[PDB]
Amino acid sequence: TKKSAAEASKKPRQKRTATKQYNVTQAFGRRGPEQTQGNFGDQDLIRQGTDYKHWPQIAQFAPSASAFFGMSRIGMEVTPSGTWLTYHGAIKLDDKDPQFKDNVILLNKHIDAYKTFP
Amino acid sequence: TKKSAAEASKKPRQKRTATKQYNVTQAFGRRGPEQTQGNFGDQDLIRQGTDYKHWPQIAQFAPSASAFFGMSRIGMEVTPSGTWLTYHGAIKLDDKDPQFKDNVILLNKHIDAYKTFP
């Protein structure tokens, strides 16, 4: 088995994209009870990466860099290991669309994914 | 009295873009005690928003939606008041580029500038 398969190559972490022939868990993180593991990723996502259904349904409403560098609690330190930036905040979901509940349930399945995983 | 009819027109839901004729604080939040109202900011940014000197240097290393949604501790409750998205995560800057050193200073301007506002 492998645990650090991501170390075999070098990819842009900002533009990271998992593919149907690459381990999604290696690209981003593995499900677990900690934020550093990955609090989002259903058992269907891990099977195909970007070839997974509904993936673009999340990407459509996604926020641009403006709020990310606007109210997301921008704070970093310049350490010898390199800079470490953090982001904290909240946003209201797209309540005006007829697909609002579908988006809420879709997203919730990935969050509470580890709750139904073996 | 409400009268606000502008909201009937289609404005960017999560693609907030503040222009020279607009107020960055109205698009994000008003710099104050709450974390979510964007306590950080530069008084020269509020002048023009997207027309601010160095504006594209921030977005040049912004995480794509694929990175923004996964290892970011995404959690939201389905409340009557709406669904409230929250997040907590870290990012590594584009420390493999020569402009990184300039970006560090530029980004930090807004992080300390708020404390020097009148």
CA dihedral A109, A12, B12, A97 (to 10 degrees): -20
Beta bridge partners of B88: A88
Neighbours of A39 (CB within 10 A): 25
Interchain contact B35–A (C-beta under 8 A): yes
Say how far apart CA A43 and CA A114 lie, in whole Å. Answer: 9
Contacts of A74 by beta carbon, 8 Å cutoff, 6+ apart: A85, A87, B40, B107, B110, B111
Contacts of B30 by beta carbon, 8 Å cutoff, 6+ apart: B37, B38
Rg for chain B, CA atoms, rounded = 17
Say how far apart CA B74 and CA A87 lie, in whole Å. Answer: 12
User: How was this one solved?
Assistant: NMR
CA atoms within 13 A on the CB side of A22: 19
Structural domain range at position B88: 1-118
Nearest Cα to B71, choosing from A36, A63, A57, A110?
A36
Contact B16 A67 (CB under 8 A): yes
Of A40, A84, A104, the CB nearest to B90: A84
Domain count, chain A: 1
Handedness of CA A63, B106, B38, B21 (dihedral sign): negative
Beta bridge partners of B78: B83
Give B107's contacts in chain A (Cβ within 8 Å). Answer: 69, 74, 76
